[PDB]
């Protein structure tokens, strides 16, 4: 088929040429135009009709988030953000994801050759995804507080920051603990957790090694460690694992799902959400085999139907569900395994 038409917006002249070199070197994509700011990009989008836009967050003289707001409103298209591994970049990137950008990449040190080739392969991966991606609050009432043995595990990748936000926002304070692994670099996961916390009735935080796993709390995996459930005596604990990535994933959804299958078993509900790849598929099968009920986000609501698809294909998914029914289905399911207290 034809090459993917990419438009790159970046304030740095060197980056605009770097992106040109990277993207054009791949045979299934090409840079049809570059632009240093949102104004020049506007007319180039109309002239060259790109399929994918890469957008650097830090543009000095203007405001790129309002460009992204207007773009997603009047001409929505796949947008991949390019961010710096900084706190200011993390806040702007998450806000970009709220406005409708589907994914983002962090710039490594491109002065080192291996950082340039890793960035190159990552940029090509996001562009191929973005060309096919689908582009995208009542509090649930009368939820009883269940046993602290009850737990929900959630995994996500591309589109997962918005999917997770839609699932957590209506959760009442009596919701069981949630362990959440979202593919994300270190640092970003802290700002991610902090923004979700301000939007949620439950407490959302980045998971800390050794802390007890409490009802009404969601624990976000840190960007540089595997998040696992562990059992310290009688009580659930967070365990952060600095072991190696598994198929280039740390935190890994598979690792989380397996640890939950092991230490929670039938007292858990597993949820696999939008994202590319197969992370979570094999762990969800262990969860299923341990007696946990498992849900997978359906294709019509996924930005990328990759991770739920692979989980389904592995045979460990009980139920496919639209994103906007996930909150109710997972609460109802985990509640059904809870005997009366009264
Ligand atoms: Na090319
Ligand atoms: Na909160």
Integer Cα distance of 48 and 127 in angstroms: 17
Integer Cα distance of 221 and 53 in angstroms: 29
Integer Cα distance of 4 and 26 in angstroms: 10
Ligand (nearest to CA of 21): 1
DSSP 234-300: TEEEEEEE-SPPBTTBSS-HHHHHHHHHHHTGGGEEEEE-SBSS-TTHHHHHHHHHTT-EEEEE-GG
Integer Cα distance of 227 and 250 in angstroms: 9
The upper half-sphere exposure of residue 266, i.e. CA atoms within 13 Å in the direction of its Cβ, equals 4
Cα(121) to centroid(ligand 1), Å: 13
Cα(183) to centroid(ligand 1), Å: 28
Ligand (nearest to CA of 175): 2
Q: Where does the chain show beta strands of DSSP type E?
A: 4-9, 29-35, 52-56, 79-83, 103-106, 151-156, 177-182, 203-206, 217-220, 226-232, 235-241, 268-272, 293-297, 319-321
Cα(216) to centroid(ligand 2), Å: 9
Cα(169) to centroid(ligand 2), Å: 9
Integer Cα distance of 112 and 135 in angstroms: 35
Catalytic residue among 26, 254, 279, 301: 279
> Which residue, chain included where needed, has tokens 């959804």?
253
Q: Which residues surround ligand 1, an ion (CB under 5 A)?
A: 24, 30
Structure tokens given for 132? 């096919």
Q: What is the dihedral of CA 136, 124, 132, 66, to 10 degrees?
A: 30
Is 11 known to be catalytic? no
Cα(3) to centroid(ligand 1), Å: 7
Structure tokens given for 246? 């598994």
Integer Cα distance of 254 and 42 in angstroms: 41
Structure tokens given for 109? 């040190």
Structure tokens given for 14? 């060197």
Assign residue 217 a region (left: φ > 0; alpha: ψ between -120 and 50; beta: otherwise).
beta
Integer Cα distance of 32 and 244 in angstroms: 38
Ligand (nearest to CA of 203): 2
Residues in CB range of 226: below 8 A, 6 or more apart: 240, 241, 242, 243, 250, 251, 252, 255, 256
Buried b (16+ CB within 10 A) or exposed e, 201-219: bbebbbbeeeeebebbbbb
- State which H helix or E strand residue 189 sits in: helix 188-199
Catalytic residue among 56, 83, 175, 183: 183
Tell me which method was used to determine the 3D structure: X-ray
Integer Cα distance of 167 and 170 in angstroms: 7
Question: What DSSP designation does 33 have?
Answer: E
Closest CA to 52 of 37, 69, 32: 32
The CA-atom distances, in angstroms, between 2 and each of 6, 53, 125 are 12, 17, 17
Residues in CB range of 167: below 8 A, 6 or more apart: 154, 271, 273, 323, 326, 327, 330
Are 140 and 157 a contacting pair, CB within 8 Å? no
Is 279 known to be catalytic? yes
Is 157 known to be catalytic? yes
- 3-class SS of residue 46: helix
Ligand (nearest to CA of 2): 1
Cα(35) to centroid(ligand 1), Å: 19
β-pairing verdict for 203-206 and 293-297 = unpaired
Quoted resolution (Å): 2.3
**Phi, psi (5° rounding) for residue 315?**
90, 15
Integer Cα distance of 267 and 238 in angstroms: 16
Cα(265) to centroid(ligand 2), Å: 27
Q: Which residues surround ligand 2, an ion (CB under 5 A)?
A: 197, 200
Structure tokens given for 306? 């990759």
**Phi, psi (5° rounding) for residue 30?**
-155, 150
- 3-class SS of residue 181: strand
β-pairing verdict for 226-232 and 235-241 = antiparallel
């Amino acid at each position: 088929m034809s090459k993917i038409r990419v438009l790159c917006v970046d304030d740095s002249a060197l980056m605009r040429q770097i992106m040109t070199e990277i993207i054009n070197s791949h045979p299934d994509m090409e840079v049809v135009a570059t632009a240093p700011d949102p104004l020049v990009a506007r007319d180039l989008i109309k002239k060259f009709n790109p399929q994918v836009l890469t957008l650097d967050v830090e543009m000095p003289r203007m405001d790129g988030l309002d460009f992204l707001e207007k773009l997603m409103r009047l001409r929505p298209m796949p947008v991949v953000m390019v961010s710096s591994l900084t706190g200011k970049g993390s806040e702007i990137t998450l806000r970009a994801l709220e406005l409708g950008a589907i994914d983002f990449v962090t710039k490594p040190q491109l002065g080192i050759r291996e950082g340039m080739l890793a960035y190159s392969e990552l940029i090509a991966e996001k562009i191929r995804m973005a060309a096919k991606a689908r582009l995208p609050t009542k509090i649930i009432q009368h939820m009883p507080l269940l046993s602290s043995e009850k737990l929900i595990a959630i995994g996500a990748s591309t589109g997962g920051t918005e999917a997770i936000r839609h699932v957590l926002q209506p959760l009442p304070p009596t919701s069981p603990a949630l362990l959440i692994t979202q593919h994300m670099p270190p640092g970003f996961t802290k700002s991610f957790a902090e923004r979700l916390n301000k939007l949620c009735q439950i407490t959302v935080k980045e998971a800390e090694d050794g802390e007890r796993v409490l009802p009404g709390h969601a624990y976000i995996a840190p960007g540089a460690r595997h998040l696992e459930l562990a059992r310290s005596g009688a009580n659930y604990q967070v365990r952060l694992n600095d072991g190696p990535p598994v198929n280039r994933h740390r935190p890994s959804v598979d690792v989380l799902f397996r640890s939950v299958a092991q230490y929670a078993g039938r007292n858990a509900v597993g949820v696999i959400l939008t994202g590319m790849g197969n992370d979570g598929a094999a762990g969800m099968l262990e969860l299923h085999q341990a007696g946990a009920y498992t849900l997978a986000q359906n294709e019509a609501s996924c930005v990328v139907f990759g991770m739920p698809r692979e989980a389904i294909a592995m045979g460990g998914v009980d139920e496919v569900v639209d994103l906007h029914q996930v909150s109710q289905r997972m609460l109802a399911q985990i509640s059904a395994g809870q005997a009366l207290r009264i």
